Scaffold this active site. Structure first.
Site, short mmCIF file in Angstrom:
data_model
loop_
_atom_site.label_atom_id
_atom_site.label_comp_id
_atom_site.label_asym_id
_atom_site.label_seq_id
_atom_site.Cartn_x
_atom_site.Cartn_y
_atom_site.Cartn_z
N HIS A 1 -6.23 1.14 8.35
CA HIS A 1 -6.44 2.00 7.21
C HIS A 1 -7.31 3.17 7.73
CE1 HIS A 1 -6.55 -1.64 4.57
NE2 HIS A 1 -5.77 -0.86 3.88
N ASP B 1 -11.03 2.30 7.79
CA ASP B 1 -11.44 1.08 8.50
C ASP B 1 -12.08 1.59 9.82
OD1 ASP B 1 -10.12 -0.86 6.81
OD2 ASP B 1 -8.37 -0.96 8.05
N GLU C 1 4.20 -1.43 -0.88
CA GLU C 1 3.71 -2.80 -0.99
C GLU C 1 3.22 -3.21 -2.39
OE1 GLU C 1 0.79 -4.30 2.00
OE2 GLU C 1 0.39 -5.66 0.47
N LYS D 1 2.16 -5.75 -5.49
CA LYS D 1 1.05 -6.63 -5.90
C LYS D 1 1.04 -6.55 -7.45
CE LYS D 1 -3.55 -8.30 -4.90
NZ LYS D 1 -4.91 -8.05 -4.43
N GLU E 1 4.33 -8.86 0.70
CA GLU E 1 3.25 -9.74 1.22
C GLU E 1 3.47 -11.09 0.58
OE1 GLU E 1 -0.77 -8.50 1.84
OE2 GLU E 1 -1.42 -10.29 0.59
N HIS F 1 1.17 -12.03 -2.38
CA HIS F 1 1.39 -11.17 -3.55
C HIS F 1 2.54 -11.62 -4.40
CE1 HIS F 1 -0.87 -7.52 -1.70
NE2 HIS F 1 -1.63 -8.57 -1.88
N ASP G 1 -5.47 -14.59 0.53
CA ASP G 1 -5.35 -14.04 1.88
C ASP G 1 -5.73 -15.05 2.95
OD1 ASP G 1 -4.31 -11.52 1.29
OD2 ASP G 1 -6.29 -10.55 1.17
N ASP H 1 -1.82 -10.17 7.21
CA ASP H 1 -2.88 -9.49 6.35
C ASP H 1 -3.55 -10.66 5.63
OD1 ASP H 1 -4.35 -7.93 4.29
OD2 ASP H 1 -2.45 -7.32 3.37
MN LIG Z 1 -0.90 -6.64 2.40
MN LIG Z 2 -3.33 -9.87 -0.23
#
Ligand SMILES: [Mn+2]
Ligand SMILES: [Mn+2]
Ligand SMILES: [Mn+2]
Ligand SMILES: [Mn+2]
Ligand SMILES: [Mn+2]
Ligand SMILES: [Mn+2]
Ligand SMILES: [Mn+2]
Ligand SMILES: [Mn+2]
Lengths: 393, 393, 393, 393
Positions: free
Chosen positions: C52, C55, C179, C181, C215, C218, C255, C291
């Site tokens: 990112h 990051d 992505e 979620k 993901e 997710h 996660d 991830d």
């Molecule tokens: Mn992810």
């Molecule tokens: Mn996640």
């Protein structure tokens, strides 16, 4: 609206003082001075304020710092009139509580968490709080092999029975209330629902002074009926305090305003707290405490708005639930549906189990097929509650 | 594989006998003769069979019909050797139980359901069953105003304490086990989880002979940790029977084969039943009963396959869980993580609450920051269980 | 099982660099130096690293600072040989992003967020990345009246097509991966599942270079089947990248390590990545990216362990998944159940609708009760999968 | 509030005709005569009736029989004036359909199911229906290896494009509406959410006449926001029909009366059907159809009551939802929160990517900390919505 102090709206310091850091971001609000928090809450109509130890007194605070803070805090209580009905301890933020407080695998942390609790019991008594809440947020695991499940419950028992025996030993006029949560921050939290909470208290030595502090959002995180669960706490005479808020579904603990989650369940939660049960029985007469969090998208004007809204929502709901039960068509609808009929015992005064088996008309000669015809009319009765709630009736 | 009768694999008649009608369709299999069911189960390796009254004896059956059926049933038990360890009653299919059995709003149905229970208690004793299960599937509501929540629990208490007092009065060597379910067939079922079940038993007059019958899929329908819940039942000495099956997520009760749902949780469920707790404590020594349903897409060859698979799965899992705890790297991983350390009491023998508060090294002079450094290493320990389960170690 | 660069295992800097800060507590681990992340993962087996913008480069970094950091990271990469296959933008941590980046209600914020994405495309291109991932985590609402939902999608579209337009114009060898979620941090997130992401992509001006980054955890947060979800993404040819981890239920985004959640779902995801579709069809070729978050209870030994465990789990599953399809018995079961029959078109070559309705054997004279007798034997095919997963076969 | 034909309220024959059969019990009500369904709903306020081929014509009906039934129903319709706006096929109750219709593994079954759809198109066209709804409820699996998932979608596609091709060829004024459901009766259903339905439609040869039929309770079964889901369907112009009912959580398909589930979500769904989007955009015009089930506890008075209650709830919500947007105070709040600002394109007319990244005020010199100060006041806009819903305003 117009909440007045006899309403017993108490708010935690961490609700309105919640700055906005979530898992994906930093705080969006400047910290909130506790003295400021007290004056603002009293101005809005609250009756009291509650706090976690580290909410008021930093973990690092020196003795000199602790007394400075308590002076200003106590002056504010004094200036405004708020009570301090409940106190609780932080056993979840500091990195030391990463595997729990009371049920930490590390014995030295178990002792440290228990000694933090005992000292906090002394402060609770000093402030005049009648309830000491215990939210075991780090007690649990992410993995099933992380813990000896039986020993985790023996270590939870030790902490609670040690704290209780200390209350009895000092003669503080305090009761302990456990607060269940199914998950978050742990993958699985021990005593995840009201039933577990309730069951656990029954294995304690000092169970007499231990009760529950159910929270709307937490039961709703397991898909449960919140009214059903508080009903059961009350029926067991263990509903010592309550946390009211909103949750929209099974997800992370949202902590919305009371009424901004499942509105129909909030309607019946308020009917049980205010009206109690259709046939008579127990009532909850403690504080109506709000454990919520102002959405991070809003500034301080939403903070006081959100605080106002909790109280509004509860009096809006209270109003319709009073009108609802008082309405003669609702009372007759209830009679049709058998609400009062459930109140009659199944057995006739004096009838033994042997008697009823042997009573030909209850079994042998019973027309099952004819009893099944009955229209309970629960849909019509549901429709009468929704229309009352919608302000239509 | 090769399940043998000492394994204590008991199966209900309604599992293998489940013909396939679901909410959206008719049965896809021809009915299953009970005598046929007995011979097939014994051939596969089972120890016993369980049933609901209406599973064997039609609701309409005459007295003459009831004895014909019981003769053939008892001859089969005799021919094969199966025991009948648990018996239960149907208080959910007939239209008469549309608002419940014990907690029906209609008083005449409450009596009819209770008299059905008492008679069934007589049959349970006659068959040699040691447990009488109670699954209150229609006790609940779709709407929150449908019931007086306090009276619903008083009426549930009356039924269970009447049945219990009858067992004690007759001196049957029977125990009652409640089976919790959060929903389906009702929107909300009373005593929805193990905690609620457990808590409720503590308010009974005859609670001593009342325990639980938790079912994997049911706790998983509320998002709960099944091992966590059976752990708690056992710790309370209330785990009297068990129903093993598979559930993939929060949805309708799937009733899959044990191990076809959450596989890692089934691994730890088998570790607790077979191995018990890391530091020692209670063990469950009753039958390993399977409450599942053969998928409707498969014929009778899948019916016996599914029955074989339940037993296979449990012995496959048992094998890896024995290897897992016996492995020295796992035992050392456990020691690092503090599993044995949780077993030590928090308080030193003799130390009072006043003592520890006052013990400078547990609180005042405690280095919190240093205790937080600790690597619990729960991820490495989880990895060791998964690799053992995967057959890798 | 030992990972090699040929396995295409990728990890984000934020994963192993996850400090431990959650909603109820603070960081439990020190910050990770990026240089060190690179080196460490290089010796573990990693193919590459992902990040990112923030990051690596602090939000407020000066040019000198930015340059330094970049030279240090680029050094590291050169030294270890690690590729940078995907780069993403952080549009969620700063307070500015509280209502979204691309779909914020404030128009200056939306332009800033888009500026920040454009600049990040440049960096992604200089780094040699093939994928540019968009995770719109602040795009959504807590309350239903907070957004004009048609307008939220137009604003989403505008931002994504602007980013895509720029890629095309610049000659950059980059594709965008959305992505999904469902919730968290907001109560409801726009484009909540793979289904919603694929749908949105077809309304874009430039959807040819826009695909998905599903993901594992997710999809499991709305209780969907991961494996079915990437199967639709693959079928549509829109599976551009993937995020592997573990989730144990409908709750907060756990996660966990890949395979440390739903094990059987992990096995079948692996089966689909490695063996593709039983009758052939497209195959996923990108990086196998994790991830996840090393649990906060573990110290730095635990971080590398957990990283190690991700690649370890995937390889173990792969070995079993290739053994499963290689097995003759499993191939027999597959034929019996109709797995290969599914791949056979329903109509015959050049048969129209009319021809089918008119074919008597197909409708008018079809023996529906006789076709319903087929034993699909799906239970037994699933027992065979589980037995291969457990390595008992 | 009294429904009139101008309200476009539609009901299925299977709804009020739902006999009470669930998974744990039998029918509690007698079969409903179709003629009588028609007449009854006509006096209630209904606009029209909808049915499934087998709701009206038994699966095994002879030609004489079929004709009779059709003449009787058509009579009824003529007499009462009721329209038949949608017709659907039953591809789920007969045992033949146990593995699906369109995506069954058996190829003869898939042809039968498609034949049965084609013939049903004819009937739908003779009846004057504008919509042809496909609910693929047996399309899915319990187990992950039971299907070749790429092949399941091709088979789905083949069937849907064949049905669409036939419509086009025949000159029929009919559009196909797909209806998602995540699970139940299968453990996992193909095209589980609105997102998955919209995605699939774009891969079809004939997707111009194929859109969605989203059901309130079905989206809530994976915990998604209904209102967001139909907002994406509307935005894509694929909202062809709608199914309104109530669901109280992630569990079995409750099919309660519209507004008898999530109340605030119902209010906002109504707001979106009636007021459309705040900044304008497409508007839904079809029938307001209820696919619910009168609870099985209620007799026939309860059936008509519940039917009545559906239209009653919708009208009450509508009245409140039009009062809410008409309110000046609510419009003020909307402007403050940025509801209208959202509708403003992010870029300026003919501004490119490059121009934006280069605009200094937009990125390089944007004051991010100052933009983060905005008080969105979303809490207060939501309190205003709730206050209008409760009719306290
Ligand atoms: Mn992810
Ligand atoms: Mn996640
Ligand atoms: Mn909470
Ligand atoms: Mn709370
Ligand atoms: Mn079950
Ligand atoms: Mn069971
Ligand atoms: Mn439905
Ligand atoms: Mn529907």
């Amino acid at each position: 609206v117009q909440p007045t102090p006899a309403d017993h709206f108490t708010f935690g310091l961490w609700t309105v003082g919640w700055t906005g850091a979530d898992p994906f971001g930093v705080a969006t609000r400047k910290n909130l001075d506790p003295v400021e928090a007290v004056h603002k809450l009293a101005e809005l109509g609250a009756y009291g304020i509650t706090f976690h130890d580290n909410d008021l007194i930093p973990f690092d605070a020196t003795e000199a710092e602790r007394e400075k803070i308590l002076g200003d805090f106590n002056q504010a209580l004094k200036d405004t009139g708020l009570k301090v009905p409940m106190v609780t301890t932080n056993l979840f933020s500091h990195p030391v509580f990463k595997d729990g407080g009371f049920t930490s695998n590390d014995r030295s942390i178990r002792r440290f968490a228990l000694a933090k609790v005992l000292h906090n019991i002394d402060l609770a008594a000093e402030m005049g709080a009648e309830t000491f809440v215990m939210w075991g947020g780090r007690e649990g695991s992410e993995y099933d092999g992380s813990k000896d499940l039986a020993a985790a419950l023996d270590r939870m028992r030790e902490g609670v029975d040690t704290a209780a025996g200390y209350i009895k030993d000092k003669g503080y006029n305090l009761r302990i209330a456990l607060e269940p949560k199914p998950n978050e921050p742990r993958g699985d939290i021990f005593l995840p629902t009201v039933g577990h909470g309730l069951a656990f208290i029954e294995q304690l030595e000092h169970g007499d002074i231990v009760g529950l502090n159910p929270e709307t959002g937490h039961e709703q995180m397991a898909g449960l009926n919140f009214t059903h669960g508080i009903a059961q706490a009350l029926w067991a005479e263990k509903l010592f305090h309550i946390d009211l808020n909103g949750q929209r579904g099974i997800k992370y603990d949202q902590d919305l305003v009371f009424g901004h989650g499942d509105l129909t369940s909030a309607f019946f939660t308020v009917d049980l707290l205010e009206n109690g049960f259709p046939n008579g029985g127990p009532k909850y007469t403690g504080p109506r405490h709000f454990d919520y969090k102002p959405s991070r998208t809003d500034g301080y004007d939403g903070v006081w708005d959100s605080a106002k809204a909790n109280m509004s929502m509860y009096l809006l709901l209270k109003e319709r639930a009073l009108a609802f039960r008082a309405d003669p068509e609702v009372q007759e609808a209830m009679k049709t549906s058998g609400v009062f009929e459930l109140g009659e015992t199944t057995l006739n005064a004096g009838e033994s189990a042997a008697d009823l088996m042997n009573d030909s008309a209850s079994f042998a000669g019973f027309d099952a097929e004819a009893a099944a015809e009955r229209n309970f009319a629960f849909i019509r009765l549901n429709q009468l509650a929704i229309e009352h709630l919608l302000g239509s009736r």
